[PDB]
Amino acid sequence: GHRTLASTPALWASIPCPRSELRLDLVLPSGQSFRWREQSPAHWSGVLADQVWTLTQTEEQLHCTVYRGDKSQASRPTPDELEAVRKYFQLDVTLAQLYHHWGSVDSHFQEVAQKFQGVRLLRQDPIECLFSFICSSNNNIARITGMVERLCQAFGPRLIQLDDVTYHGFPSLQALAGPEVEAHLRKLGLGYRARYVSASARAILEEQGGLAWLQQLRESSYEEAHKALCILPGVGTKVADCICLMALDKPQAVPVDVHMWHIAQRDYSWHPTTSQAKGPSPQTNKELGNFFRSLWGPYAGWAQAVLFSADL
């Protein structure tokens, strides 16, 4: 079954990481990745790179364990595996520097940060992020979490079973580009966005030269990446910004939806001054995003994530 640090200590290895730099409970269930669950108190299990991990923390350390299945002997994560975890959590960025900057320009942020410490922005795989945000509206974390689980159960490789939980890899393009994908996703309860999952997979595979197209957007400017993503069925401005932020290494991206508007009004008394519109629209949404980029700086999307963790 699922491991705990206490039950099987020799299968865990550690990364130095103060709780000031990372709070798993404030990050993993906060609406960035949908692949994690707290199966044991303070222990988060999920898929990171088509492998199952469990993570837990002590005061100065992130402890990690990886499940290898029947082909390999059980052993602690290797140094390269642990680096993969560090990259996922972007641990080379000093969060304290960012928090100090954001609090210096934003008193509301500084207030919220006192309770919501160690909220980091994950660095997600581009396929996984794209298709997670295509497959469901992101109106409720519980809904999207369920839809993503169904998608991976449907078209993702079976990795391992732990207790009553069967973990799947994220689906491949080829899997998602099949005939019958839409219909089978609608049969599982995904509804009209099932069509976008299929069509976007086929678009990337057939028309854009495959996975490399999407991977190249990590190196491309925010402007090029956003525009490129918007060509895909099911991706408009907000999803494209989500992907840019969360998987294409554009920390400046600030996705704008009704949730962000609510925070802007509730916590900032913000009103648009460019647009004629009083409410969400393409022009006013752009304005809002540029507002927070201008306020918070080049890591504005990371600052947004702190406020989203606090709002849950």
Numbering used by the authors: 12 to 323
Publication passage describing the model:
Here, a series of new methods are presented based on the use of a low X-ray-background film as a crystallization support and a photoablation laser that enable the automation of major operations required for the preparation of crystals for X-ray diffraction experiments. In this approach, the controlled removal of the mother liquor before crystal mounting simplifies the cryocooling process, in many cases eliminating the use of cryoprotectant agents, while crystal-soaking experiments are performed through diffusion, precluding the need for repeated sample-recovery and transfer operations. We have previously shown that the transfer of crystals to X-ray data-collection pins can be automated through the so-called CrystalDirect approach, which relies on the use of a thin, low X-ray-background film as a crystallization support from which crystals are recovered by excising the film with a laser beam and attaching it to an X-ray data-collection pin. The CrystalDirect system enables the automation of sample mounting and cryocooling and can contribute to closing the automation gap that currently exists between crystallization and X-ray data collection.
Some of these crystals grew in conditions that require the addition of cryoprotectants when processed by standard manual methods. However, in all cases tested the automated laser mounting and direct cryocooling after liquid removal with the CrystalDirect robot produced samples with very good diffraction properties leading to high-quality structural models.
